[PDB]
Design a protein around this ligand. Structure first.
Ligand SMILES: Nc1ncnc2c1ncn2[C@@H]1O[C@H](COP(=O)(O)OP(=O)(O)OP(=O)(O)O)[C@@H](O)[C@H]1O
Ligand SMILES: Nc1ncnc2c1ncn2[C@@H]1O[C@H](COP(=O)(O)OP(=O)(O)OP(=O)(O)O)[C@@H](O)[C@H]1O
Ligand SMILES: Nc1ncnc2c1ncn2[C@@H]1O[C@H](COP(=O)(O)OP(=O)(O)OP(=O)(O)O)[C@@H](O)[C@H]1O
Ligand SMILES: Nc1ncnc2c1ncn2[C@@H]1O[C@H](COP(=O)(O)OP(=O)(O)OP(=O)(O)O)[C@@H](O)[C@H]1O
Ligand SMILES: Nc1ncnc2c1ncn2[C@@H]1O[C@H](COP(=O)(O)OP(=O)(O)OP(=O)(O)O)[C@@H](O)[C@H]1O
Ligand SMILES: Nc1ncnc2c1ncn2[C@@H]1O[C@H](COP(=O)(O)OP(=O)(O)OP(=O)(O)O)[C@@H](O)[C@H]1O
Ligand SMILES: [Cl-]
Ligand SMILES: [Cl-]
Ligand SMILES: [Cl-]
Ligand SMILES: [Cl-]
Ligand SMILES: [Cl-]
Ligand SMILES: [Cl-]
Ligand SMILES: [Cl-]
Ligand SMILES: [Cl-]
Ligand SMILES: [Cl-]
Ligand SMILES: [Cl-]
Lengths: 167, 171, 162, 167, 172, 171
């Protein structure tokens, strides 16, 4: 009966899984096919798909420019080059291509809310803090995302309730 | 060096670990001793000690009332009764006393900030949202706590001193 | 230990009572003499001096303008009323004057026992120039914006009220 | 022209008087019966019914708890004890049963607005100070009450003009 | 795509030009006919008509009171008396009637926005600063006006659709 | 003496005129020497030096980036190439090099305040709108600039006093 963060977050019920980058296991081609196949403004970065523990958030525009420059740089970066967002590379097999550190375009302090947070509180946070997006979590794990336009679409939905009257 | 959330949060460098409750595995006696041995206004609730995954925040004031109400009823809840913050009671062996659900006093939406967040941005969040406290995390794992008083103490340190940074509180 | 509105409000203990105006018993001269003696930024208006019931607040800068323009059968013995209509006067008395349209009919009020941390809070959140202090419906004193500032200079717990 | 506080306040025209407490003359059963026959979140307290000079505002919650704990205390509190919200008891004859002071649960600083105050301002005050209710006075005389729920219903009705857009 | 200050500002396309006062060159009579023939709350005053450089904003009611009080004085102030909002009286031909200084009723700090400014930004400024009106310029030249009611009408129209700009208002 | 915007704005009487770019007549070489010789975060662009009519505000960051890119390209910009911020190019003599349109990095709606605006009002505006800087005009003409830091320093001066009541209002 009470609208919560999980009710508004994407993905919804019949939506695909959250489009996420791993901190350690994405190749340059993986991320490029993500950039070409999506229009999302940004991507959460997690430790692994298993943990779904949030490492940060990275914008599409930054990735394009970074990777674009990277292949353009002759450090030898190729398609099968592993990208990492950690300070140091992960352990790599004998004959593997040069890596690409993208730590410097990662937002290490993304705004996050619990899935059980009331939407009234999320709306308020968005207004007072001027958020462009919010990540939604359950017990430390990444579940979904709420953007500014999602918040607006939710407000619109209510407008047709007394919770709409207090916003 | 810019001051971050990790620089203001407790525990400080090489102090004992955050005083936390588990969502599942602590008894009334556990909580009783924690309450008895500490004066903290509240406690983070974590999935487990090894996971340190944040579940919520629970006030001492509220723990006291609930545990004292649980005693008076004399309905099986004893010192060896398990306290749980989940929706359902944890699976327990035979002859174990009834459990105590304290979920209704758990704040399941505590505010959180990464350990790397600039204190400037923390101070602003406290001001804009009127936070009583803030929890500090690393990669989804609970690390520390900052309270309104910790922020005020931090601001006071700047106030009478780097003074321009204090004036950033106005903006 | 807690400082209240009655500890900051004027008049202080043993000070001349509030320079107030009435709504039915204030002649032009009585107002002109008050302006020519005091230098307060504004004056409250009450039903009567005996009732001390708050009707509104009128600024000083607003009083002089309206008085000097109405005398250019308004004399020194003309009763000024802050109500909507003139009170019943004897047939011989000269015409009256209405200053209703320059009175703040919705001034802000606080009780004499209101904690200053709340008075200051209301001054910041509403941006008040002044606040009238009452006790059980009766005007008692006044706290201006400068009084709040002088109380802010008094005060650890200072940064908490920011 | 403008809608004023006296257009939204309760009680409405041809409605029953405000359910109020006196500061000196309510007994223990008097208040209890008032509590039982009403559902209002709270009640104003006035010097006397004749004066309607506002003394404070007390919540239903606090009245219930205070009164119940007073009978449990062996001060000798009974059904016919005088309840007062003043600092000291009213002049009583010696043979009268011990009294019950309830000043410590009275809001001595309730927010008040004059009846001529435009609702625009009232809404603003409610929004800026986050009020639960406001008391409406006329020349130092309590006239009515405006709660937050009252204000929201008023905003709702505005939509059905640009006094609405003003808010 | 998104609405600009120039889309909301008045006067609209092909209506008479902004009604302004010059800082230096208009007569008591000029202002009086403007006052009695319009209902605008106020008027921008500009350096000159050729420059359209904003000096300030002046309320109608203040002009009425000030001009009324002046003609009743006299000094001198006749229909052909020049009104100036500058600090000093303008250089004038010999044996002309006394001038009228109305600077003490001029708002020398009006708020201005460029015509290219998004309404979303304009609405936010009006809100946060509590503006009564806003003047709109092009490259330092006065072009138009937007009053609080103009903003309110804009928001109202926005609700009947671009519609996300109205949702941005309910959100801010 | 009530402090006004002209009292806090730069340049002060002792300073050289504002460092400004023109909308139409600066070459790439002109803007590069300016960037080399100054440390200002940004520059107002005016119609012309004589008119000082404001067109916008451009940042140093963006000037550097955009210019570095323009001269890297074949058949791109050279020292003598004219930069412009207008929608269309100015009329140039034939056989002159390619021009550089920098309209796309220009803030076309920079906040502006008249020189006679009380500083108290300027401060309110900075806080409420969250400005980085504010351009100060006299009768439509660009006169000076007030940056956030300028404002913070002005406030600090009022704090380090004992005038102090005027600082308390800011608090
Ligand atoms: N990385 C992601 N993975 C899955 N869904 C996402 C991701 N990022 C955003 N979304 C969701 O997809 C939708 C598109 O959001 P996106 O960030 O692409 O722009 P937006 O916030 O809708 O605003 P706009 O389209 O104006 O930039 C939103 O509902 C958002 O919650
Ligand atoms: N659960 C906890 N475990 C470890 N340290 C804590 C915990 N809770 C609070 N602290 C730290 O202990 C100190 C005091 O905590 P407390 O909860 O008493 O908050 P406080 O507001 O400082 O005290 P008070 O509410 O009386 O002003 C603070 O520095 C706080 O960060
Ligand atoms: N009507 C009044 N009667 C008695 N005292 C008053 C009255 N109005 C204000 N005061 C007191 O007079 C003192 C001076 O305030 P005053 O009204 O002169 O303005 P201020 O607060 O000094 O600010 P300013 O003079 O710059 O407008 C204040 O402490 C105020 O409480
Ligand atoms: N003491 C009172 N006497 C008369 N009417 C009252 C009194 N208190 C409240 N009311 C009116 O009764 C109605 C119900 O108000 P009440 O305080 O009971 O709750 P509310 O403000 O409606 O909020 P909620 O219904 O969610 O508890 C409101 O219109 C209010 O104005
Ligand atoms: N000097 C002016 N010249 C041309 N148009 C103006 C001028 N002043 C205002 N306007 C426009 O004329 C219309 C009426 O403006 P005006 O200020 O008279 O009333 P308003 O903004 O509706 O406020 P009010 O209800 O108090 O009269 C508005 O659309 C406004 O933009
Ligand atoms: N284009 C300019 N011409 C003249 N003076 C300027 C110009 N731009 C800024 N200033 C002034 O020069 C000083 C430095 O401004 P600048 O924008 O370079 O840095 P700042 O914002 O003051 O501080 P910071 O180094 O943190 O950005 C300030 O006093 C500012 O008012
Ligand atoms: Cl894990
Ligand atoms: Cl889990
Ligand atoms: Cl890790
Ligand atoms: Cl009467
Ligand atoms: Cl009486
Ligand atoms: Cl009394
Ligand atoms: Cl031009
Ligand atoms: Cl100087
Ligand atoms: Cl010119
Ligand atoms: Cl000039």
């Amino acid at each position: 009966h009470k609208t919560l963060a999980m009710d508004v977050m994407k993905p919804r019920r019949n939506d695909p899984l959250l489009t996420v980058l791993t901190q350690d296991s994405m190749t340059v081609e993986d991320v490029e096919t993500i950039i070409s196949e999506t229009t999302y403004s940004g991507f959460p970065v997690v430790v692994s798909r298993e943990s779904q523990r949030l490492v940060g958030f990275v914008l599409r525009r930054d990735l394009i420019i970074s990777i674009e420059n990277a292949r353009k740089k002759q450090d030898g970066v190729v398609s099968t080059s592993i990208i990492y967002f950690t300070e140091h590379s992960p352990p790599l097999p004998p004959y593997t291509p040069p890596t690409l550190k993208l730590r410097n375009i990662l937002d290490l302090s993304p705004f996050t809310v619990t899935d059980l947070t009331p939407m009234e509180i999320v709306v308020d946070i968005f207004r007072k803090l001027g958020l462009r997006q919010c990540l939604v979590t359950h017990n430390g794990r990444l579940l979904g995302i709420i953007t500014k336009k999602d918040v607006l679409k939710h407000i619109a939905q209510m407008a047709n309730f007394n919770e709409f009257l207090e916003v």
